[PDB]
User: Which sequence fits this backbone?
């Protein structure tokens, strides 16, 4: 076929019930994730091709960057609760990987303050049980697919994007193939 299991995607032999329709995993420590966000705008281009009525979910993971990696998953939970994903994503990536000015929870917090979230609001969200369960969700979703690598996308709890089997000569052509593959899997 044009789209084949093991080529543009793999199938989970252990499918995950009740999973979000389009589920994406990343880490601010993850170099390809930086590319996916900054250079390729994958999430965005997938959205532009998804049928509407489809919701898009993105979660952070713990298994990179030890202690700070976990701080980052809590901070992303804060970003999700406050609805400010789009204001912190870029400065978090660049603070971790480009300028390397993020070294502690306090530096993560500085990024949010600078992005305009109030101190009081950030620390209250940081310490809230709504953020604790949001952290719990992120971990559970990753756990459910025995996730050992990022970036990673799952569709309908049963297909996993396989970007290694797509062309990388052309950045734009890669993205479209990637997004079309999500759409195909979506309609499957």
Assistant:
């Amino acid at each position: 076929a044009q789209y084949e299991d093991g080529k543009q995607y793999t199938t989970l032999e252990k499918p995950v019930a009740g999973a979000p329709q389009v589920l994406e995993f990343f880490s601010f420590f993850c170099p390809h994730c930086y590319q996916f966000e900054e250079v390729l705008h994958i999430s965005d281009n997938v959205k532009k091709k998804l049928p509407e009525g489809v919701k898009m979910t993105k979660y952070h993971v713990n298994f990179m960057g030890g202690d700070l990696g976990k701080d980052l998953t809590q901070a992303w939970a804060v970003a999700m609760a406050l609805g400010v994903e789009d204001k912190v994503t870029v400065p978090l990536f660049e603070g971790v990987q480009k300028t390397q000015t993020i070294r502690s929870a306090s530096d993560i917090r500085d990024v949010f303050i600078n992005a305009g979230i109030k101190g009081e609001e950030y620390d209250a969200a940081w310490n809230s049980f709504v953020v604790k369960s949001l952290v719990a969700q992120q971990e559970k979703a990753a756990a459910d697919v025995q996730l050992r690598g990022v970036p990673a996308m799952f569709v309908n709890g049963k297909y996993q994007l396989n970007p290694q089997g797509m062309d990388t000569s052309n950045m734009d052509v890669f993205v479209q193939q990637y997004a079309d593959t999500v759409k195909y899997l979506s309609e499957k």
